[PDB]
Design a protein around this motif. Structure first.
Motif, mmCIF file in Angstrom:
data_model
loop_
_atom_site.group_PDB
_atom_site.id
_atom_site.type_symbol
_atom_site.label_atom_id
_atom_site.label_comp_id
_atom_site.label_asym_id
_atom_site.label_seq_id
_atom_site.Cartn_x
_atom_site.Cartn_y
_atom_site.Cartn_z
ATOM 1 N N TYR A 1 0.886 -5.437 8.090
ATOM 2 C CA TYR A 1 -0.129 -5.370 7.051
ATOM 3 C C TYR A 1 0.174 -6.347 5.927
ATOM 4 N N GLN A 2 1.313 -6.168 5.252
ATOM 5 C CA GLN A 2 1.559 -6.875 4.000
ATOM 6 C C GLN A 2 1.799 -8.364 4.187
ATOM 7 N N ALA A 3 2.072 -8.816 5.407
ATOM 8 C CA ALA A 3 2.048 -10.233 5.701
ATOM 9 C C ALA A 3 0.680 -10.693 6.162
ATOM 10 N N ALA A 4 -0.065 -9.836 6.854
ATOM 11 C CA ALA A 4 -1.438 -10.171 7.180
ATOM 12 C C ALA A 4 -2.331 -10.168 5.954
ATOM 13 N N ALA A 5 -2.163 -9.189 5.061
ATOM 14 C CA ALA A 5 -3.117 -8.969 3.978
ATOM 15 C C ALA A 5 -3.081 -10.050 2.909
ATOM 16 N N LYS A 6 -1.998 -10.823 2.863
ATOM 17 C CA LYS A 6 -1.868 -11.904 1.890
ATOM 18 C C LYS A 6 -3.079 -12.831 1.966
ATOM 19 N N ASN A 7 -3.831 -12.707 3.055
ATOM 20 C CA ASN A 7 -5.031 -13.499 3.280
ATOM 21 C C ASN A 7 -6.067 -12.659 4.015
ATOM 22 N N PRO B 1 0.813 -1.223 0.000
ATOM 23 C CA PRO B 1 0.000 0.000 0.000
ATOM 24 C C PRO B 1 0.840 1.264 0.000
ATOM 25 N N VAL B 2 0.175 2.387 0.276
ATOM 26 C CA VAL B 2 0.804 3.669 0.581
ATOM 27 C C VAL B 2 1.889 3.484 1.632
#
Lengths: 115, 82, 188
Positions: free
Chosen positions: C18-24, C3-4
């Motif tokens: 975020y970017q490890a959580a958001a993968k799912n 993201p931003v």
């Protein structure tokens, strides 16, 4: 009496850092031993770097050391043998005779950090 | 309703040796010592160039007031400092 | 595709979270867990904030993480391990920052383009509402995404108003115009 072990958390040059455990920190200028496969190796408590982590100075060839080796407290500073038994003999820095005349038996060990 | 108050009553009493006799008005913990200098966490109401006393009984004085900590130089050997 | 950007210093915990959580996905659930844990830090302000000190321990920090997970199901998902790492990394003090920043990233994902309508005195609701819709339907917002809007009171300005959002602003206020009024008359 339990001995205080620690882990070799950082080797930089000839300066070794040890992570100890909770409230097990030796006071400044205490000898520390670690048994190499070549012999024993001595550290001296120089800096409390905070968070059970102590920076110490090496006393011999520091190569080959794995991180996290179980270093051992000696409690006190470097104590050397004294008395007339020490006369005419060749001693290294850590109180050991290197004259190959066996050890120097002595009733007194004395620390090298007195007033 | 009750278990957050349980966690609070534990946590205020979990560091009760550190949280009480404390609040750093006239108290501090030896954060890190080196070369005859203790950087000390705490001591909020302390003054500049004020004499301080250790529990070991060797005295020091504060020179660097900082937001994080207090630099204290020592009048004795740092062997008595943990 | 991150993201931003949180741009380096200590948002990188929140960035990786975020970017490890958001993968799912689960970042709404992770987000709500973060809201709830910052709440129970806030709901116990004595030694919830006063115990983000660095001089404690490794063990006692981990036990405070245990008190946080002891409070029902406060933590959920990666956010406990987050804390396991954070506790070990002793970056617990700068935890408030992480929260607010994850909120910014989250409501960026929603697209709430927070704005502002600076003044030197608060204004009537009709002005608020008319401005609100203006920017909302303006090319600024591409729609499909929201548009908050906050009036603030600024004495350092002499009145007027200035609209702000997306590092893009318009000042039609008084202070700046007086300034331009003094500059132009400052020539021979």
């Amino acid at each position: 009496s339990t001995p205080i072990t620690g882990k070799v958390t950082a080797v930089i040059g000839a300066i070794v850092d040890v992570h100890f455990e909770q409230s097990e920190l030796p006071a400044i200028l205490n000898a520390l031993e670690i048994k190499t496969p070549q012999g024993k190796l001595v550290l001296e408590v120089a800096q409390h770097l905070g968070e059970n982590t102590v920076r110490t100075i090496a006393m011999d060839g520091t190569e080959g050391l794995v991180r996290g080796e179980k270093v051992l407290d000696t409690g006190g500073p470097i104590s050397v043998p004294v008395g007339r038994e020490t006369l005419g003999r060749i001693i290294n820095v850590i109180g050991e005779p290197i004259d190959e005349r066996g050890p120097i038996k002595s009733k007194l060990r004395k620390p090298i950090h007195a007033d | 309703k009750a278990q957050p108050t349980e966690v609070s009553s534990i946590l205020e009493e979990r560091i009760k040796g550190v949280s009480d006799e404390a609040n750093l008005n006239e108290t501090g913990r030896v954060l890190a010592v080196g070369d005859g200098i203790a950087r000390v966490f705490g001591l909020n109401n302390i003054q500049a160039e004020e004499l301080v006393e250790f529990s070991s009984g060797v005295k020091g004085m504060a020179l660097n007031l900082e937001p994080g900590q207090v630099g204290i130089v020592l009048f004795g050997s740092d062997r008595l400092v943990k | 595709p991150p993201p931003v950007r949180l741009f380096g210093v200590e948002g990188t915990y929140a960035t990786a979270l975020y970017q490890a959580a958001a993968k799912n996905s689960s970042i709404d659930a992770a987000f709500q867990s973060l809201q709830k844990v910052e709440s129970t830090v806030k709901k116990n302000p004595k030694l919830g904030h006063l115990l983000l000190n660095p001089a404690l321990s490794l063990k006692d920090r981990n036990s405070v993480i245990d008190a946080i997970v002891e409070t029902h199901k406060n933590l959920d998902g990666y956010v406990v391990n987050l804390l396991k790492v954070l506790s070990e990394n002793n970056r617990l003090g700068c935890f408030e920052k992480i929260a607010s920043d994850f909120g910014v990233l989250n409501d960026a994902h929603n697209g709430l383009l927070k704005g502002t309508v600076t003044s030197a005195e608060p204004l009537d609701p009709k002005s608020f509402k008319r401005i609100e819709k203006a920017l909302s339907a303006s090319k600024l917002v591409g729609q499909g995404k929201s548009l908050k809007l906050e009036n603030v009171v600024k004495p350092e300005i002499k009145g007027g108003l200035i609209v702000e959002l997306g590092d893009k602003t318009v000042d039609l206020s008084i202070s700046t115009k007086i300034q331009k009024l003094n500059k132009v008359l400052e020539d021979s």
